Design an enzyme around this catalytic site. Structure first.
Site: not given
Ligand code: ZN
Lengths: 27, 533, 320, 244, 100, 44, 84, 148
Positions: D110, D115, D118, D157, D168, D177, D181
């Site tokens: 990603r 921002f 990933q 995740n 990420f 997050l 994550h």
């Protein structure tokens, strides 16, 4: 030696012979 | 300083216990560690003792091992002090040496907690060790019940139909039986007023109540929890169960219907007592007259001996396996009825902060529990007497006998077991033996259990209420005959179902040496003496 | 560094049970005919020494009996408990005849003077009290400890009164003035046991930190018996020079008194139905013959140890 | 003894019923707080009574300090320090992705508009790749070093038990997050390359860039998970020559 | 505090004479010369020495179960002591006696 | 197995199993002499 | 008589409250419990009217009882509609 | 015996406030409800540990197996499979059918105002801390000091 705080409440296996008995009864 | 009087015992002990734990904190903790946190350890000790009282598994997930050892050790000390105080106070209460309301109420609470700890232990041990009934014993019991019901030409009890003839009369009888307990018109509480309102609602609209009862019989298999408490009779405690009133109405109707159908179809043979025909003093008189009117009952010229055995079944209610109970009840009634009967006993028993699932024992607080107890006792009567003597005692199914009569003298004299009666769990058997049968039984009992030093007199028990001439004369032959008879009766019953203990029983022998026949039926101690002797 | 003398090891040979509480204290009659135990069962039991049979059981205490002593020159049995009361029992009728009263908290132990017939008791109210025996009069109140006084020892020679308390201090008192004389602050934890040597004019003190041997009358520090790092509840010494240290975790250590050398570690088992946390020595005493060791274990047992005569010096060699 | 013991006058169908039924038929793992079996078995009569204490097991990635992984992607060679004390599962998942080729040669999972970006997932769909155990390991975000700030490296995740290989780097502080994550650590090198990768044009539908930042190579500048595995292998081989 | 004039009822004088041990009551002058060791061995040895047409069936033949009271023998099982107050034999006898 | 009942249900090892054969296990309840019998007999 | 085993009562008591006082005490306690759960949940949609009624500003819905607003948690779709 | 959703929300709030073992304190809030009814409603339906999911293959196999073994004992069967008795009984019936402070400060201010009004117009055996040192303990002297 850490001691957690007390969380007060005021403030399984089956034996197999069971199965055998049930089978016998059915028979 | 004030002394430690009686009213200042218990709290002071706790105070001393607290101080001891505090000392055992302050030298266990190593060098460093500014946060002692001894108040948290005392809170953990209080929580561990409170979890011990309610039989709750206490486990702090992260806790240092010497602190856990200290807490378990001091909680075991407090529990030992608590249990020994309960034992001593119960001995003083049974002796009558203490007239104190607080001591009686505290001891009743302590024994309720101890009984529920033991009962939860028993239920978990039943679920872990498997059924005690094994396999072939239950198959033999089931086969004997099937052969007995085939021999009596028994018609099975059907379901209550949609338009039953006597359903309103049974509902009226069950509602009067439930309204019996609330006739004092006292202050009551919310639950008793709710039960009385449910009784009045079922009384006003009986058709809707009967439809709800039959719907509950057809559908529901999981039930609400039951409360338990104890009556202090100062010599023993009696368990009292509390049931939700809708289930009480359904169980009362089922009890009335089952007892009416079993009486109409003649399931119960006449030796099963208490029957509705006589009061228990009339039962005592009928038993004495049935002893007296036997053929040549007092003739001891040829060494004939009479044996009167009285006993109980001990833990009969606690050892009724529910799967075997369902299989036995399916022989009698419709399967939906028997499924309701079995599933009503598997509920949760509650008392204050304890809950446990009753999976092994029967619950005597049910309205229909008496039917199950007498049916299981019928199975035990078939195990004790055998099928042939029970068919001789009940007679043919077309012409059944009464309580203590036979079709013929030759049917009386064909077996040693002359008379038999069961009063719920009490057992009264009357044997008549010749000399050769008694000698053979004594020989077989001494073959299994030899006793050359004649120690059978010492463990033998006698009725101390009578004078020395009225008591049983303890010759060797009569004592050996009584022990032989008790051993032969105890060999018939498998210990998984029920047992008969020597200490709670009493065997009396009438012979040429003993002129008196002693027994104890209901609350009556009876001594029979013939005019010949 | 001299080599220590070889002591034969000890073995358990009988276990006596029957108490329904923790056996807290053990005393031996001076004629060596019987011994006596006090328990948390609020009962005091006289046991036969040889046969082990239960001779007598006496009730009357309302809480846990913490200390029992037998008078060597009178037919009296002195018992102190957690019920803030001291009882003098006449053995002549097996009845309590005197009540020493005045402690504000639980009495943790007591001792008798061997010559004067005066009584000393240590209690949880940070005081020791000195009582005349016949008049039941508290002739002194030894105070100065800031915490509970765990044990007390008494002797004829100067100083007469030895107190070990829970505030890591040992106080050597003076009997006639009722004032402290020597304060020893060497211990890091609570001094739970003190024992006096019968002939060497020395004594030892027990704490979870260490065991410390000192020298009368100034209390000068002699030796630091190290090891056995548990909560030591009791300390007794043989006339032959064997020191027995018993702990709250159940472990027992045996030492030579002179060299301070540990020669045996004995960790006995428990009662058949008993937790592992219920292993702990509360008191121990030798007999008058100095051949039987009697311990009051926390699993409601009395465990009796005998010398092992079959062992010799090369079979159990002295390390270093 | 025998099944026909306690059985006289056996019936017929009893005998064929029994005939048919018989014809049918650890040293370093001592965590010092012990199991709760003794205390629960003493305080309650619903279990088997056990009288001896047993120490509870504990490996939980016993590593040395924080690791540092240098990923040479198409933006350049950027070094990121992952705190094993903040999250051992995230650092172990990143080390297993860089070790078992789940991140080496992988594509960018990603990339958001400055921002979070990933990478290290071989699927490239946002939460792809594999952990050390094959399935995705458990995810937990520490409060000391969370997935907030510039260059915060987190095992990406959608929640717990979903972080396998997607690492990420968040270039901005965000609470999305947090607690979803597993935050491994922070980027300690290649801040300009990460800022140029985050500042590039990205498709907002899949939250990924048009040009995927693909990790060409991975190097272990500091490997805490491999050092913990080596210490566990040394502890196993200390008692393996006589225990085969 | 000895300045008060309040006299307790249990502080009255009682048992003013100390009883001492007599000659047969183990006075210390006969304790000091004795040897307890040997006497303890013959007391232990004494304790160890004192430690030691139509034919019918039988009438009970037509039953279902037999010899069910075969392995029923308590003997030394009442001599067991358990330090668990819920699993003691005395507590089990207590619970079967006092609860019906 | 031959299924043990709840009436017996032998938890714990016996004392001879725990302490071994050499240790004499004594279990004592009730006093051998009554309370009227005095410890240390009076002279008369 | 057993003075220490009679039911407990104290002088100058005033007796047990009636049905109306117990009902309004139960209503005040239910209002306090609803306000405590609102402050624990930190919901900004709850408002008290000038006539003293519960209002959901995110739903713009009045409530007669406290449990009417406690069951108003549709509200997710109305919050998504009022978010833009 | 009906249960409105308002009463369910009030019961959930009362359990989250008062814990578990208090039930009469919970049933004080709910009108026309008992503590036994509240406990049964919590442990039957509103407990968050109740698995409100669908049955797996393993769950259905274990349910059919245990219903074959122990017939109509659902209070024993249900903690083995983790569901409640009503859910497992209903699912077994479905499977067979499928198979078929300030106030004190104000009082002190009023007392000070009354004292100033009386001054403008015993000691009760106490200790006056403002007059001198209450228990004066002098510091120990040694090797130094020239006072001030
Ligand atoms: Zn809303």
């Amino acid at each position: 030696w850490k001691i957690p705080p007390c969380i007060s409440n005021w403030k399984v296996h089956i034996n197999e012979n069971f199965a055998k008995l049930a089978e016998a009864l059915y028979i | 300083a004030k002394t430690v009087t009686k009213q200042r015992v218990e709290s002071h002990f706790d105070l001393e216990l607290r101080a001891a734990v505090m000392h055992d904190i302050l030298d266990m903790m190593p060098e460093g560690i500014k946060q002692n946190k001894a108040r948290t350890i005392l809170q953990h000790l209080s929580e561990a003792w409170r979890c011990w009282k309610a039989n709750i598994p206490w486990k702090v997930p992260g806790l240092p091992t010497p602190i856990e050892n200290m807490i378990l050790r001091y909680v075991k000390a407090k529990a030992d002090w608590w249990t020994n105080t309960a034992h001593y106070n119960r001995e003083r209460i049974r002796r009558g040496a203490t007239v104190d309301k607080t001591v009686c109420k505290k001891n009743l609470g302590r024994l309720t907690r101890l009984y529920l700890k033991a009962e939860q232990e028993r239920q978990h041990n039943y679920l872990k060790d498997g059924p005690y009934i094994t396999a072939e014993e239950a198959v033999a019991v089931y086969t004997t019940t099937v052969h007995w019901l085939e021999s009596r030409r028994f018609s099975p009890i059907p379901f209550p139909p949609l338009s039953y003839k006597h359903d309103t009369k049974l509902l009226i009888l069950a509602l009067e039986r439930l309204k019996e307990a609330y006739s004092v018109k006292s202050r009551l509480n919310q639950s008793q007023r709710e039960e009385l309102g449910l009784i009045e609602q079922a009384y006003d609209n009986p058709h809707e109540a009967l439809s709800r009862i039959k719907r509950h019989l057809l559908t529901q298999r999981a039930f609400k929890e039951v409360g338990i408490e104890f009556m202090d009779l100062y010599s023993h405690l009696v368990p009292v169960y509390d049931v939700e009133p809708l289930e009480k109405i359904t169980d009362a109707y089922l009890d009335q219907y089952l007892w009416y159908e079993a009486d109409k179809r003649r399931l119960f043979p006449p030796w099963i007592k208490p029957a509705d025909t006589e009061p228990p003093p009339l039962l005592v008189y009928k038993w004495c007259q049935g002893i007296n009117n036997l053929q040549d009952v007092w003739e001891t010229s040829e060494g004939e001996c009479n044996v009167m055995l009285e006993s109980r079944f001990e833990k009969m209610y606690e050892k009724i396996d529910l799967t075997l109970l369902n299989r036995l009840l399916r022989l009698i009634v419709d399967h939906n009825i028997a499924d309701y009967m079995t599933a009503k006993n598997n509920v949760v028993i509650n008392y204050k902060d304890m809950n446990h699932t009753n999976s092994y024992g029967i619950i005597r607080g049910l309205q229909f529990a008496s039917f199950i107890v007498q049916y299981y006792g019928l199975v035990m009567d078939l195990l004790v007497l055998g099928l042939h003597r029970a068919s001789e005692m009940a007679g043919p199914p077309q012409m059944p006998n009464d309580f203590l009569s036979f079709q013929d003298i030759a049917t009386e004299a064909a077996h040693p077991i002359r008379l038999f009666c069961r009063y719920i769990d009490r057992i009264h058997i009357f044997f008549r033996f010749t000399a050769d049968e008694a000698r053979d039984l004594i020989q077989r009992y001494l073959t299994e259990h030899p006793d050359p030093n004649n120690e059978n007199i010492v463990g033998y028990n006698n009725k101390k209420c009578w004078p020395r001439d009225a008591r049983m004369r303890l010759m060797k032959h009569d004592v050996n005959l009584g022990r032989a008879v008790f051993w032969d009766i105890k060999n018939r019953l498998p210990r998984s179902v029920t047992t008969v203990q020597w200490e709670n029983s009493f065997v009396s022998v009438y012979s040429k040496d003993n002129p008196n026949l002693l027994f104890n039926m209901c609350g009556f101690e009876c001594r029979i003496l013939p005019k010949c002797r | 560094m001299p080599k220590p003398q070889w002591h034969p090891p000890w073995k358990l040979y009988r276990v006596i049970s029957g108490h329904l509480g923790w056996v807290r204290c053990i005393a031996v009659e001076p004629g060596n005919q019987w011994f006596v135990t006090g328990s948390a069962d609020r009962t005091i039991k006289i046991w036969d020494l040889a046969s082990g049979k239960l001779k007598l059981s006496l009730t009357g205490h309302i809480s846990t009996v913490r200390g029992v002593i037998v008078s060597t020159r009178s037919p009296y049995l002195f018992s102190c408990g957690e019920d803030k009361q001291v009882k003098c029992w006449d053995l002549e009728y097996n009845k309590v005849i005197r009540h020493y009263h005045g402690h504000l908290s639980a009495v943790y132990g007591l001792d008798l003077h061997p010559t004067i017939d005066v009584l000393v008791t240590c209690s949880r109210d940070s005081t020791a009290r000195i009582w005349d025996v016949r008049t039941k009069a508290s002739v002194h109140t030894l105070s100065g400890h800031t915490n509970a006084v765990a044990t007390v020892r008494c002797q004829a020679a100067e100083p007469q009164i030895i107190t070990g308390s829970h505030d890591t201090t040992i106080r050597l008192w003076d009997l006639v003035a009722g004032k402290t004389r020597v304060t020893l602050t060497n211990h890091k934890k609570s001094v739970r046991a003190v024992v006096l040597h019968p002939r060497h004019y020395t004594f030892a003190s027990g704490s979870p930190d260490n065991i410390k041997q000192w020298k009368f009358p100034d209390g000068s520090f002699i030796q630091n018996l190290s090891g056995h790092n548990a909560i030591i509840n009791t300390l007794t010494v043989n006339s032959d020079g064997v020191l027995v240290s018993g702990a709250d975790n159940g472990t027992m250590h045996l030492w030579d008194w002179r060299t301070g050398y540990n020669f045996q570690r004995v960790h006995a088992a428990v009662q058949p139905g008993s937790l592992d946390s219920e292993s702990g020595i509360f008191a121990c005493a030798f007999d008058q013959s100095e051949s039987r060791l009697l311990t009051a274990e926390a699993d409601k047992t009395i465990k009796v140890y005998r010398e092992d005569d079959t062992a010799t010096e090369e079979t159990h060699p002295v390390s270093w | 003894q025998d099944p026909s013991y306690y059985l006289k006058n056996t019936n017929a169908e009893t005998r064929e019923t029994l005939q048919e039924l018989y014809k049918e038929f650890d040293k370093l793992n001592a965590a010092h707080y012990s199991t709760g079996k003794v205390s629960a078995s003493f305080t309650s009569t619903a279990m088997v009574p056990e009288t001896t204490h047993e120490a509870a097991a504990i490996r939980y990635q016993f590593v040395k300090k924080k690791g540092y992984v240098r990923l040479h992607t198409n933006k350049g060679d950027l070094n990121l320090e992952l705190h094993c004390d903040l999250t051992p599962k995230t650092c172990e998942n990143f080390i297993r992705l860089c070790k078992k080729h789940y991140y080496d040669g992988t594509i960018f999972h990603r990339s958001i508009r400055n921002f979070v970006i990933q990478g290290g997932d071989p699927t490239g769909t946002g939460t792809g790749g594999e952990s050390y155990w094959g399935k995705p390991f458990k995810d937990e975000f520490r409060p000391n070093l969370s997935h907030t700030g510039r260059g915060i490296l987190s095992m990406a995740n959608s929640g717990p038990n979903s972080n396998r290989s997607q690492f990420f780097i968040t270039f901005r502080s965000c609470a999305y997050l947090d607690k979803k994550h597993t935050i491994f650590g922070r980027v300690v090198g290649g801040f300009d390359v990460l800022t140029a990768m985050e500042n590039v044009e990205s498709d907002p539908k899949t939250d990924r860039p048009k040009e995927e930042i693909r990790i060409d190579a991975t190097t272990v500048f500091v490997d805490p998970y491999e050092e913990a595995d080596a210490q566990i292998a040394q502890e196993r081989k200390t008692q393996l020559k006589v225990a085969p | 505090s000895q300045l008060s004039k309040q006299y307790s009822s249990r502080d009255l004088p009682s048992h003013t004479k100390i009883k001492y041990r007599q000659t047969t009551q183990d006075a210390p002058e006969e304790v000091r010369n004795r040897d307890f060791r040997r006497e303890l061995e013959e007391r232990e040895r004494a304790a160890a020495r004192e430690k030691n047409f139509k034919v019918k069936r039988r009438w009970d033949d037509d039953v279902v179960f037999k010899n069910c009271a075969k392995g029923v023998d308590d003997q030394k099982k009442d001599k067991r002591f358990v330090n668990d107050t819920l699993r003691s034999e005395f507590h089990k006898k207590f619970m079967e006696k006092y609860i019906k | 197995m031959e299924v043990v009942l709840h009436e017996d249900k032998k938890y714990y090892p016996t004392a001879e199993e725990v302490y071994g054969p050499e240790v004499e296990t004594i279990v004592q309840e009730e006093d051998t002499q009554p309370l009227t019998e005095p410890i240390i007999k009076p002279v008369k | 008589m057993d003075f220490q085993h009679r039911p407990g009562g104290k002088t100058g008591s005033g007796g047990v409250a009636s049905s109306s006082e117990s009902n309004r005490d139960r209503r005040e306690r239910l209002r306090q419990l609803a306000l405590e759960t609102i402050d624990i949940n930190k919901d900004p949609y709850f408002m008290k009217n000038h006539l003293g009624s519960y209002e959901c500003k995110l739903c713009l819905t009045l409530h007669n009882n406290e449990g009417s607003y406690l069951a108003h948690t549709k509200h997710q779709t109305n919050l998504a509609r009022r978010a833009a | 015996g009906v249960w409105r959703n308002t009463e369910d929300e009030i019961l959930k709030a009362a359990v989250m406030k008062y814990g578990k073992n208090q039930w009469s304190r919970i049933a004080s809030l709910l009108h026309r409800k008992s503590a036994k009814q509240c406990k049964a409603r919590w442990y039957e339906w509103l407990d968050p540990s109740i698995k409100k999911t669908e049955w797996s293959r393993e769950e259905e196999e274990k349910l059919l197996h245990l219903a074959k073994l122990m017939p109509t004992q659902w209070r024993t069967i249900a903690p083995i499979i983790g569901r409640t008795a009503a859910q497992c009984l209903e699912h077994y019936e479905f499977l067979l059918d499928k198979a078929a402070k300030a106030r004190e400060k104000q009082l002190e201010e009023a007392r000070r105002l009354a004292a100033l009004q009386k001054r403008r117009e015993k000691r009760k055996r106490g200790v006056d801390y403002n007059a001198e040192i209450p228990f004066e303990k002098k510091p120990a002297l040694g090797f130094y000091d020239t006072s001030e």
